[PDB]
Amino acid sequence: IFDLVVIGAGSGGLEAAWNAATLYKKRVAVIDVQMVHGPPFFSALGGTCVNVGCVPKKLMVTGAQYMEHLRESAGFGWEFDRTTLRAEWKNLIAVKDEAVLNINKSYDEMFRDTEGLEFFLGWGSLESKNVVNVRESADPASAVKERLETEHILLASGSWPHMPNIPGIEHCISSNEAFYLPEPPRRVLTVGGGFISVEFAGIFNAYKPKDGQVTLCYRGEMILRGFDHTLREELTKQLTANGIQILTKENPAKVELNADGSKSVTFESGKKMDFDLVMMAIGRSPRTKDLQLQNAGVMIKNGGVQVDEYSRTNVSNIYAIGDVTNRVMLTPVAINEAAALVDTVFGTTPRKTDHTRVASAVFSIPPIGTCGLIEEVASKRYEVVAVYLSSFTPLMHKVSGSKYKTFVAKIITNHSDGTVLGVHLLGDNAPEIIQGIGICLKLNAKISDFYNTIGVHPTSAEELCSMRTPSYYYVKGEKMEKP
Amino acid sequence: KIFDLVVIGAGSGGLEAAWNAATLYKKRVAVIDVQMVHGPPFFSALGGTCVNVGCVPKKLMVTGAQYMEHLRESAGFGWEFDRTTLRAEWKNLIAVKDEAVLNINKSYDEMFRDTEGLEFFLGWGSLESKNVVNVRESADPASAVKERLETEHILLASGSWPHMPNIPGIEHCISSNEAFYLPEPPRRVLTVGGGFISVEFAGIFNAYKPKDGQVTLCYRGEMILRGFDHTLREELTKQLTANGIQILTKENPAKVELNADGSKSVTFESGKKMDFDLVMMAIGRSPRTKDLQLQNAGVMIKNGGVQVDEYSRTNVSNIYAIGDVTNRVMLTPVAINEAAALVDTVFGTTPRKTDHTRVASAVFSIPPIGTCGLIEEVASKRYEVVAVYLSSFTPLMHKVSGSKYKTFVAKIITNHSDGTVLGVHLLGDNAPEIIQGIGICLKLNAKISDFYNTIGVHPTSAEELCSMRTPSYYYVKGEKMEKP
Ligand SMILES: Cc1cc2nc3c(=O)[nH]c(=O)nc-3n(C[C@H](O)[C@H](O)[C@H](O)COP(=O)(O)OP(=O)(O)OC[C@H]3O[C@@H](n4cnc5c(N)ncnc54)[C@H](O)[C@@H]3O)c2cc1C
Ligand SMILES: Cc1cc2nc3c(=O)[nH]c(=O)nc-3n(C[C@H](O)[C@H](O)[C@H](O)COP(=O)(O)OP(=O)(O)OC[C@H]3O[C@@H](n4cnc5c(N)ncnc54)[C@H](O)[C@@H]3O)c2cc1C
Ligand SMILES: *CCN(CCCl)CCC[C@H](C)/N=c1/c2ccc(Cl)cc2[nH]c2ccc(OC)cc12
Ligand SMILES: *CCN(CCCl)CCC[C@H](C)/N=c1/c2ccc(Cl)cc2[nH]c2ccc(OC)cc12
Ligand SMILES: *CCN(CC*)CCC[C@H](C)/N=c1\c2ccc(Cl)cc2[nH]c2ccc(OC)cc12
Ligand SMILES: *CCN(CC*)CCC[C@H](C)/N=c1\c2ccc(Cl)cc2[nH]c2ccc(OC)cc12
């Protein structure tokens, strides 16, 4: 009774549905647990990107950024009664919710006006390799409310925050709750070295009350593992200078709820500290358990649904795309996988996604933009690697008072042929700059293609077109220099 | 010939050429300029237009003008303060602008000291013969020689200057030069010109204008920004308008009179009459050739500028010309490039020229514009089949910031026959930054599919560029077609 059934109406899911019903005229059934955003399930029609990810965080970071402009405006002749300055977390949340709602709504209207596309509210799971059930709850015992029969099934259940098993985790929240806080914490602790943690620390630091304080902790050596070491270093000094406290090598042992309502946190090191909020952002895991995978023999690899380059599971006719497959957890990748999938299944040509050289950003303050390999991986796959590095304080920061705001541009190449392996930036507008550069690496651009390009002046980006001599090299993993 | 090279002008092209000749080629270089530090009376100095009355100062100033937007839009995200206490101190802006510029002028001087084979000469430069350059105390060829320089090669890099039209009253008007030194922001100002200088300054004035100030922009043609994509010209016009700037198209000043209160009365050919406290003319720049005494060497002048060939050579051996003076592409980076190419061509093993095609550039208007390649109108005349891909949207933040008129426009033009990208034009915040990597793309002969097969960075405005798959319309032998 259905060609395709997607479990999850997220970015991948919707993309796969839409495409199937429009370019292939297939009867598509789509399942999600909520129509509009917010608790109790947080996610809804639209997925993480829409309800508790990309969209709302960008609105908030944009909000958090105003603290910089309002401070920096002074250096260019802008005055006002700074003592009357206050941030209304409630407004932020209020507008955030309207915006999200309008999108949940817009999505609903979509199913209406689209033929062959039907939406089904409830939890979905596999009965058999061709039977998908919509129940009223995550409990496989709860009441079936629909029994869908189909030839093809696509899994797109996304991921979910991972809460560690430490005593008192019940006193902490994940990123989900954070988008609904009724008031901004005075003292907040964000746990995690990753983007989510970093981004939120930026947000909380801006809308924090009078003697508020944001503390970020990580179990490792320095934040943002997996990113260029120069950015991790620079980002830490900048976040620090903005008044954010970063604890490295610290890992929460237990959280206890004091009488005033505060939370006492005890770190394995023995340190004790109080906080009004404890946000855990240590990881996201594919949401597989509730799918009853066993009822069809679909394999699971590292918590996620195993697939092959074509997004196919081990059971013909059962495909998986997105966060659920644990490859690259970025919205655009999901959307891209879905389209490739759909073509490969109901079209004339099989097509897969290129998970390499994907540009991405971190919306911290200041932000980061990146594409390709970090040196440390590069020197392991190539014998001769050249590193081009640039660091400078943009003019505007010279005059805005934010002298600590250094812009960092780093280019990494395979010295044998000039090919560009990775470009990493730190500084205002980075996310925006990295995009075309993403196209550059798909075109196998080489360093000379950059420096032979005429710069746009004056801009930060033009730095990328003026790096001609490497600062250092890696010869079979060893660091060398030119005498 | 006590000098290998003599550069007249210490701007972007000249400095780059000087530096490269003395450092990579160990040549004795002489460089001349009329002032060491910015400001009146000559405005330009060591550093050139980019440093003293161009790129640098205009970016600082536009940067300042943007705060008006952020200050207004902050309200949308929960930022409150006593808006009635809000004021702009033009004098502060000018104060920090001067310190920044001064520091660079100083950094430049120091460079001449620490660099061997590089010598700086203060004064007006001119040719005596094809191998003799004179430094005089004034622009007048009669003034006192203060130095006689013999050399084997001469580089002309005098740049351009504002062009004041010969209309009655021009003496009551000013140019972009004086604008950087205004002691007070005009209450009613009129900027004359449709170009970038006029548009960029309109936004500056509009942000630091007093209480019931008013900025008026007039252009004699149909719509601002001639030479740029029609969609951007239209959009930009609505957006400037919605911010309180008044734009008069099809108006052409006839005369300016100085009233007794000190205001300036402006009479347009059309007969209209309006009063202003400031009249800024920004109708163009001309290569500075007259004071060089080109005749003493036979160097040819084409359209107001020094004639040169692809290798930047004049008609007289050993006399080269790079930069604004040659009237090709008046951008800082183009000048810098021509100089390096020139220097390699003359004192190096290999001849090299600059590619004046596909050069990215921007207009620091509010919002700004970023562009690269051909505009449809020119495309449809060189190619039989042209596809125009067009996107328009109000970014998320502008939905919530209260600036709903700030639409983002992305436009991609291609040669439909093979998919090659001919031009990319953007309008919206951060466009200038977005266009750069895009400039690299067209140097690599990218094609529309290379864009859309790229995974986007989300969420950002730039990502739109990677998601335009179907053309909105085409140009078939200049006619506009569409798919039924
Ligand atoms: C705080 C945060 C910020 C982020 N910011 C960015 C960013 O700036 N840029 C970026 O590229 N990425 C960002 N991401 C990641 C990006 O959102 C994800 O990579 C992407 O949404 C994954 O999409 P998906 O379709 O695979 O999953 P989803 O959008 O996660 O969709 C999964 C859907 O499945 C539903 N579902 C679950 N199981 C069932 C079931 N059994 N029955 C019915 N429905 C079910 C869920 O309710 C959900 O709606 C962010 C993520 C987070 C958490
Ligand atoms: C208001 C404004 C804004 C601009 N903004 C930008 C921008 O944002 N981006 C961009 O790319 N471009 C911009 N430009 C243009 C850019 O500044 C020029 O294209 C570039 O400076 C030209 O460099 P040049 O070396 O050829 O000229 P210059 O820097 O103009 O050098 C000419 C020098 O020669 C000296 N000179 C003149 N004749 C003599 C003589 N006879 N003897 C001795 N010395 C002499 C002068 O004093 C001057 O310092 C802008 C221009 C203006 C006017
Ligand atoms: C997470 C934010 N979105 C990205 C740009 Cl819309 C959602 C992506 C999912 C998928 C691409 N959805 C859409 C939608 C969904 C719903 C409506 Cl009402 C309109 C949409 N328009 C889209 C336009 C272009 C897309 O390609 C990236 C995707 C769209
Ligand atoms: C107009 C703004 N500048 C561009 C980047 Cl510095 C001036 C460009 C002119 C020429 C390229 N000059 C320089 C200088 C000049 C003086 C000093 Cl003290 C340092 C410079 N450093 C440069 C570094 C890199 C350049 O390549 C674009 C140019 C430089
Ligand atoms: C009433 C009709 N609309 C709702 C208001 C339906 C929404 C249609 C838009 C066009 N949706 C999508 C897309 C449009 C255009 C392109 Cl090129 C791609 C595209 N992809 C998706 C993918 C998923 C999806 O689900 C919401 C919608 C669209
Ligand atoms: C005391 C030594 N310095 C002054 C403080 C001299 C300035 C040297 C810098 C490096 N100047 C220039 C350049 C540096 C590096 C590169 Cl790769 C290029 C380069 N080009 C130019 C061109 C012109 C110029 O004149 C000011 C300087 C530099």
Side-chain angles (χ1 to χ4, degrees):
Chain A
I1 51 154
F2 277 118
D3 311 34
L4 182 68
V5 192
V6 184
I7 298 154
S11 285
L14 293 183
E15 182 84 3
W18 182 253
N19 263 338
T22 290
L23 289 44
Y24 292 102
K25 308 304 269 187
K26 289 277 167 186
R27 213 206 172 199
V28 182
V30 167
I31 310 159
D32 218 12
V33 304
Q34 261 201 203
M35 305 277 317
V36 321
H37 79 82
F41 313 128
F42 295 105
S43 214
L45 200 39
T48 311
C49 151
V50 166
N51 309 97
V52 288
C54 317
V55 165
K57 79 87 187 302
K58 192 75 180 313
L59 298 181
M60 302 171 64
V61 173
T62 294
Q65 191 47 223
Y66 289 114
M67 171 167 106
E68 314 291 293
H69 301 317
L70 288 158
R71 189 189 88 236
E72 298 162 348
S73 68
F76 294 80
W78 291 92
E79 29 158 65
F80 64 90
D81 188 356
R82 310 207 134 84
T83 72
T84 53
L85 187 58
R86 22 135 49 192
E88 257 290 19
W89 174 265
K90 209 32 91 177
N91 214 48
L92 179 65
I93 302 300
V95 314
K96 183 268 300 184
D97 303 334
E98 206 107 284
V100 170
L101 198 57
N102 295 171
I103 302 184
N104 285 147
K105 273 169 176 196
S106 197
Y107 272 89
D108 192 6
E109 143 221 304
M110 175 192 87
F111 281 67
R112 288 165 335 152
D113 342 319
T114 304
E115 225 260 304
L117 212 50
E118 261 165 85
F119 181 63
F120 294 91
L121 199 103
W123 294 79
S125 21
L126 285 59
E127 177 127 305
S128 62
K129 68 166 307 191
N130 6 231
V131 176
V132 185
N133 285 290
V134 193
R135 285 207 192 2
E136 335 231 355
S137 95
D139 189 37
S142 53
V144 150
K145 33 180 295 190
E146 282 310 337
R147 209 168 143 291
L148 312 174
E149 240 144 341
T150 173
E151 189 184 343
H152 304 302
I153 289 164
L154 177 54
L155 314 185
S157 39
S159 49
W160 197 252
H162 160 68
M163 301 301 259
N165 198 43
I166 63 171
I169 198 69
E170 60 255 24
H171 299 166
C172 311
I173 61 168
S174 66
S175 58
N176 287 156
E177 294 74 33
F179 291 105
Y180 302 99
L181 297 173
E183 290 225 2
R186 89 163 267 266
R187 288 123 71 200
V188 358
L189 176 73
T190 57
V191 180
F195 80 97
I196 298 178
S197 187
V198 185
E199 304 185 344
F200 275 99
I203 297 187
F204 293 131
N205 186 67
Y207 291 88
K208 90 190 162 275
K210 111 208 183 193
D211 347 271
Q213 181 58 75
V214 175
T215 295
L216 166 324
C217 80
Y218 179 46
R219 126 195 323 142
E221 267 182 276
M222 181 165 53
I223 55 181
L224 294 172
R225 162 160 134 129
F227 280 73
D228 177 87
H229 67 94
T230 312
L231 299 133
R232 305 167 68 185
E233 247 128 14
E234 273 321 306
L235 188 56
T236 297
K237 312 176 207 153
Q238 303 184 39
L239 279 191
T240 262
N242 210 16
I244 294 152
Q245 176 187 337
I246 304 199
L247 282 57
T248 51
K249 308 238 223 172
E250 299 287 348
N251 197 189
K254 66 170 170 206
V255 185
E256 305 174 327
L257 163 53
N258 317 300
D260 45 42
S262 62
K263 280 84 184 198
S264 203
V265 161
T266 307
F267 299 84
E268 300 187 355
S269 78
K271 266 162 79 87
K272 200 169 274 214
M273 319 206 164
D274 287 338
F275 300 103
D276 313 285
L277 198 72
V278 178
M279 188 190 133
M280 287 276 148
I282 58 158
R284 329 234 324 141
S285 306
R287 291 168 86 166
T288 48
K289 132 221 259 264
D290 310 344
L291 298 162
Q292 302 323 315
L293 299 179
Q294 81 256 38
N295 288 221
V298 289
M299 257 149 299
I300 288 177
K301 183 41 191 145
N302 262 205
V305 168
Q306 153 169 95
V307 285
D308 65 1
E309 300 183 2
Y310 288 68
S311 276
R312 307 213 215 59
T313 58
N314 58 269
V315 193
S316 57
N317 87 297
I318 296 187
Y319 333 93
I321 59 65
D323 282 11
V324 89
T325 83
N326 222 318
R327 280 126 124 198
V328 180
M329 307 189 315
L330 292 164
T331 294
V333 176
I335 294 171
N336 194 246
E337 269 167 15
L341 182 282
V342 169
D343 271 359
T344 300
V345 149
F346 307 122
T348 83
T349 41
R351 151 201 183 231
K352 50 171 168 175
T353 292
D354 189 349
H355 300 88
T356 61
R357 299 167 289 137
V358 172
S360 84
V362 171
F363 289 89
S364 42
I365 288 160
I368 277 168
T370 186
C371 197
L373 317 171
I374 63 173
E375 76 202 48
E376 312 102 85
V377 154
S379 14
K380 269 134 241 179
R381 311 216 205 136
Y382 300 84
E383 203 165 89
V384 196
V385 161
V387 172
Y388 296 79
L389 161 59
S390 199
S391 253
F392 61 101
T393 300
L395 200 50
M396 81 161 287
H397 294 302
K398 296 267 214 194
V399 338
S400 65
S402 314
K403 327 211 150 154
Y404 55 95
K405 278 178 190 197
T406 305
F407 189 93
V408 179
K410 188 176 207 178
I411 307 189
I412 295 156
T413 63
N414 165 359
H415 200 46
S416 292
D417 65 14
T419 313
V420 180
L421 303 178
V423 176
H424 313 276
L425 323 171
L426 172 57
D428 298 304
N429 308 123
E432 303 281 354
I433 300 169
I434 211 78
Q435 186 77 70
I437 298 289
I439 307 155
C440 287
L441 308 176
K442 269 335 266 310
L443 287 161
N444 284 285
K446 14 197 77 152
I447 185 75
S448 69
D449 301 295
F450 282 45
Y451 66 65
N452 288 310
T453 296
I454 287 154
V456 186
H457 181 64
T459 65
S460 288
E462 82 177 313
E463 267 310 295
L464 301 170
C465 291
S466 77
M467 287 182 263
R468 322 201 163 200
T469 312
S471 314
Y472 63 101
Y473 310 74
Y474 280 101
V475 198
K476 260 151 123 87
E478 322 165 70
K479 189 158 163 312
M480 315 228 231
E481 277 179 34
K482 275 207 182 193
Chain B
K1 295 175 168 215
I2 47 155
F3 280 106
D4 312 4
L5 181 63
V6 187
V7 184
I8 303 161
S12 290
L15 284 184
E16 183 67 14
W19 180 259
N20 272 334
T23 286
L24 278 46
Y25 295 111
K26 310 304 269 193
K27 291 284 166 186
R28 212 201 171 203
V29 182
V31 169
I32 308 159
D33 213 322
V34 306
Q35 268 198 192
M36 306 277 317
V37 316
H38 77 98
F42 313 130
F43 303 104
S44 217
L46 199 42
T49 310
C50 147
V51 168
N52 312 285
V53 288
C55 314
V56 168
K58 84 83 182 308
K59 187 76 186 307
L60 297 187
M61 302 177 61
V62 170
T63 294
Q66 249 295 319
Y67 290 105
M68 173 162 102
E69 315 282 313
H70 287 332
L71 288 158
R72 190 191 86 246
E73 308 169 329
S74 63
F77 295 80
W79 291 89
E80 11 141 330
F81 61 87
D82 186 354
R83 309 209 141 78
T84 76
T85 54
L86 190 52
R87 22 131 55 187
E89 253 296 13
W90 172 264
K91 208 33 94 181
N92 215 282
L93 180 72
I94 300 302
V96 313
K97 181 268 303 182
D98 302 345
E99 205 112 282
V101 169
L102 195 55
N103 286 207
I104 302 177
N105 290 146
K106 273 170 176 194
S107 201
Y108 275 138
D109 189 15
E110 148 223 293
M111 169 192 88
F112 274 74
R113 286 170 333 163
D114 328 331
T115 303
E116 221 264 312
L118 214 47
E119 256 165 86
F120 181 74
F121 297 86
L122 192 109
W124 295 82
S126 34
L127 284 56
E128 177 140 86
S129 56
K130 61 168 309 195
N131 60 180
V132 174
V133 184
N134 298 126
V135 197
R136 286 204 190 357
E137 336 237 356
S138 83
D140 186 42
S143 53
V145 149
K146 31 183 293 187
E147 224 76 328
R148 209 168 150 287
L149 310 173
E150 312 208 355
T151 178
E152 181 176 348
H153 308 265
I154 290 158
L155 178 54
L156 306 182
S158 39
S160 54
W161 199 248
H163 165 58
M164 296 310 252
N166 212 63
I167 69 171
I170 199 72
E171 65 256 27
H172 307 293
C173 304
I174 60 166
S175 67
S176 57
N177 277 162
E178 296 73 29
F180 291 102
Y181 302 96
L182 297 168
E184 291 227 354
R187 96 164 259 272
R188 278 131 46 199
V189 359
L190 175 72
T191 55
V192 182
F196 83 98
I197 300 178
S198 180
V199 181
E200 290 173 2
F201 272 86
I204 294 181
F205 287 142
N206 185 43
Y208 291 89
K209 90 196 163 273
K211 121 204 175 197
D212 351 273
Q214 182 55 72
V215 174
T216 292
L217 171 322
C218 76
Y219 180 41
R220 100 223 254 193
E222 270 184 274
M223 180 165 52
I224 60 186
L225 296 167
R226 156 159 134 129
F228 284 79
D229 180 89
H230 68 96
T231 314
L232 298 140
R233 311 165 63 185
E234 265 146 89
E235 274 304 320
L236 190 52
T237 299
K238 308 176 209 155
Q239 307 188 35
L240 275 184
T241 265
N243 206 18
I245 296 153
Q246 173 178 350
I247 300 193
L248 287 60
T249 56
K250 310 244 227 165
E251 293 298 339
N252 186 197
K255 65 170 167 203
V256 179
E257 313 181 311
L258 164 51
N259 322 302
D261 48 58
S263 54
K264 284 86 185 190
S265 205
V266 166
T267 311
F268 303 85
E269 306 264 15
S270 78
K272 268 163 73 90
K273 193 170 282 217
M274 324 201 157
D275 295 320
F276 299 102
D277 311 87
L278 195 74
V279 174
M280 183 194 143
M281 289 270 151
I283 59 157
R285 330 237 310 141
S286 303
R288 290 169 85 164
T289 52
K290 126 225 262 283
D291 309 338
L292 295 168
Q293 303 313 321
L294 301 174
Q295 80 255 32
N296 297 136
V299 299
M300 262 159 285
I301 290 181
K302 185 38 191 145
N303 264 205
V306 170
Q307 150 169 99
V308 288
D309 73 3
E310 296 174 42
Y311 285 72
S312 281
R313 305 208 217 65
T314 62
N315 56 281
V316 189
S317 55
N318 292 342
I319 297 190
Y320 330 92
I322 54 69
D324 280 8
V325 87
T326 75
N327 225 110
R328 287 126 116 194
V329 178
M330 308 193 312
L331 293 161
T332 293
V334 175
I336 290 167
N337 197 249
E338 280 169 12
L342 182 283
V343 171
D344 275 355
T345 300
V346 152
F347 310 116
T349 79
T350 43
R352 156 192 165 235
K353 48 170 169 183
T354 289
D355 191 349
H356 297 87
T357 64
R358 289 114 87 229
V359 170
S361 82
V363 177
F364 293 96
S365 44
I366 290 154
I369 275 168
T371 186
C372 191
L374 318 169
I375 56 168
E376 71 200 38
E377 308 84 327
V378 161
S380 18
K381 334 247 136 104
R382 307 221 203 141
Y383 302 83
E384 205 161 84
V385 198
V386 163
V388 172
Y389 295 78
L390 153 63
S391 210
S392 256
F393 59 105
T394 297
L396 199 48
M397 71 162 290
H398 291 309
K399 296 267 209 195
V400 343
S401 70
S403 292
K404 328 208 148 152
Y405 58 91
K406 277 178 185 193
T407 298
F408 191 88
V409 178
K411 196 165 192 178
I412 310 191
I413 290 156
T414 58
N415 176 348
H416 199 41
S417 289
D418 61 14
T420 302
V421 183
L422 300 177
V424 174
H425 311 277
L426 321 164
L427 174 60
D429 291 318
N430 315 123
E433 303 287 349
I434 303 178
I435 211 85
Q436 184 73 283
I438 298 290
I440 305 164
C441 286
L442 307 172
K443 268 330 268 310
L444 287 162
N445 285 283
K447 17 196 74 148
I448 187 70
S449 71
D450 299 295
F451 282 49
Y452 69 63
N453 280 326
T454 294
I455 281 157
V457 185
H458 184 65
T460 65
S461 286
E463 85 186 318
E464 269 313 298
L465 303 167
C466 295
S467 75
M468 285 176 263
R469 319 206 166 194
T470 309
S472 317
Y473 63 65
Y474 312 75
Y475 283 95
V476 199
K477 264 155 114 84
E479 309 152 294
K480 189 161 163 308
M481 315 233 241
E482 270 179 43
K483 275 205 178 196

